[PDB]
Symmetry: D2
Subunit: 173 residues, 4 copies
């Protein structure tokens, strides 16, 4: 099995739920998933991650709450202490993906993906067209969509997780 | 073999050379490569691409000249005519990569934005490796010194081959 | 009186209404306002603008519809033909401001403001804190807020226009 | 006189020199200038600034060193502690400007983002003038040639004075 790290920062519990969704989706993708959160400057049942352990995974999904469109200082400060890993090129060709929350945050997405790109990580974006197709799909199936994540957002997170998982699996097998 | 499109816009021939380098590297990666340029609004021997043919490739490398840090209008206007492909989701899970020439970070971000919204899998530059290269070629006995330098061309080749191999692994 | 140009691109009539609001607000700011739209690649009573006329105004407000978070090709193509003006430095120290529509578009705002910045134009941003204060204000006054622009958005546009106008007036008097 | 704060973060002394240049230029613009640096997480003779004092100035110039194209964490962490000032709207209509050192367009965009959301009036670089400068000093008889060059320092000074005069006009 490929190993995936779901690393998140949640200020109000939203991004945590999104992260759990992504992790579940990734487990359904046949990956060994570990859920962790970044240090502070809330579910304590979730272990706190270290910057140096990121090289121990084949894929890394980063999700973070946002403040007025920018990265949360916690996630950015966490990723800033991965200079050694960068110097080694330890994260090169590892699969990565980013989730952001505004509970629009394009700048945050760009910044997080910037830090991930400079590590040489392969980036898996959102499936936008599919995510707008989803409403029509669930309408056809007989169950239309309609601070706390909706069903559509969670489904999107799950799908994202599984997609990243399968892609990683393809890259290792 | 996986099929790759090296699509470029060059205002003065720089990005054309970079594109040829990338295409060569991709050929060395065991990929079937097609080199094409976007329409205007100088090498006429290089075929002009159509927006709708992008779905016919397993991987797409986009290189563009930049103006004061932004995307060239040609490339953006070309990519703006892929609305149908987006609606179909024709480019989802296709491997992509971006080269930019003049710093032009904003252009990189915009091009990668358009490629991301198509759901394309993005392959970035190997930055740490790109600083390692100087020391490498110094150890080898051949240090690096309008027209791309040897280091930049080698970087383009490496990028192309990397994308090629990644695509091959994703399709094999 | 200071002269202001309200230049806009509207695909579906939203940004046009926002632009009219901004223009009215600017007139209330004591400025001589001219409303224009960029060429195509819809109110034909509104004159089409030329790239070279931008130097004839003390202030320029740019509003544009957005496509998946990016600038509309019309506005960008229009601003791309102002190379001569840039070469002269004709727009240096002229007051500028940007409105964007998604009928979030942070990247579009950044790009438009990028083109305006490289001309050396003085940038007047949105009054964010005031714009969230506005709801509470109109609630206190006895008239709470609640494809087609809402009352709050139009009021924001008007306020923006007047603010830009007064700032420009201060810079010329 | 209008009051201006030149707030900077320097990792290796470059942005410190740029900041001194900007402060000098602003003094020549008839402004009362205070030079300060952000806290850490080398010149101890330069006073350390507090997040809440930013409202005491008519104009604020922010200069910061950059790391791989992004904002330095120090400056961003400092500006993140101005939530109260934002809630009050204390920095609305105050004149602002940004200098960045290494291309670092993303850092410029982020810093200007934080300054914009405070409602600060933004004064950019004079780019066309900054390419005019070389030809100017060539005509004058003194062509330009880790430590900022004469052209960069002159640019910093010009920026400072420009911001100063603009602020003075906005308060006069
Ligand atoms: C996530 C991340 C990405 C980085 N990307 C680059 C890079 O693209 N180019 C580079 O020269 N250094 C990069 N670095 C290294 C830093 O920019 C910095 O040069 C290094 O950590 C040493 O910094 P210092 O000696 O000034 O403390 C990166 C570091 C991190 C943590
Ligand atoms: C490169 C590209 C990316 C696009 N990404 C999105 C997207 O992420 N979400 C979306 O709703 N539409 C997306 N579109 C579709 C456009 O937003 C637009 O709706 C389409 O071109 C037709 O719109 P129009 O009739 O207003 O011209 C994209 C189109 C292109 C060409
Ligand atoms: C809105 C705008 C902003 C520009 N900003 C810059 C700039 O910051 N630096 C620069 O060298 N040229 C700038 N230019 C000029 C163009 O980048 C370009 O160099 C010039 O128009 C001539 O281009 P060409 O000879 O390749 O056609 C700007 C042009 C426009 C229209
Ligand atoms: C520099 C800066 C800019 C801010 N801009 C905005 C803004 O544009 N809109 C907004 O709602 N809050 C803005 N804020 C407030 C923060 O988003 C945040 O709500 C505030 O710091 C308190 O949030 P917290 O309790 O979640 O930490 C800004 C704060 C700072 C420091
Ligand atoms: Cl959250
Ligand atoms: Cl070129
Ligand atoms: Cl519109
Ligand atoms: Cl420095």
């Amino acid at each position: 099995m490929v190993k995936m790290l779901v690393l998140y920062y949640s200020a109000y519990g939203y991004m945590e739920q999104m992260a759990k969704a992504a992790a579940e989706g990734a487990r359904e993708g046949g990956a060994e998933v570990t859920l962790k959160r970044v240090p502070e400057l809330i579910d304590q049942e979730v272990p706190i991650a270290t910057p140096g352990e990121l090289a121990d995974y084949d894929a890394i999904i980063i999700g973070t709450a946002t403040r007025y469109g920018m990265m949360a200082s916690q996630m950015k400060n966490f990723l800033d202490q991965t200079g050694g890993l960068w110097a080694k090129g330890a994260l090169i060709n590892k699969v990565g993906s980013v989730m952001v929350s505004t509970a629009g945050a394009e700048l945050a997405l760009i910044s997080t993906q910037w830090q991930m790109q400079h590590h040489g990580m392969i980036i898996v974006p959102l499936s936008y067209a599919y995510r707008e197709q989803m409403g029509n799909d669930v309408v056809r199936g007989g169950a239309p969509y309609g601070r706390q994540p909706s069903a559509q957002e969670l489904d999107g997170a799950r799908f994202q997780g599984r997609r990243v998982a399968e892609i990683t699996a393809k890259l290792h097998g």
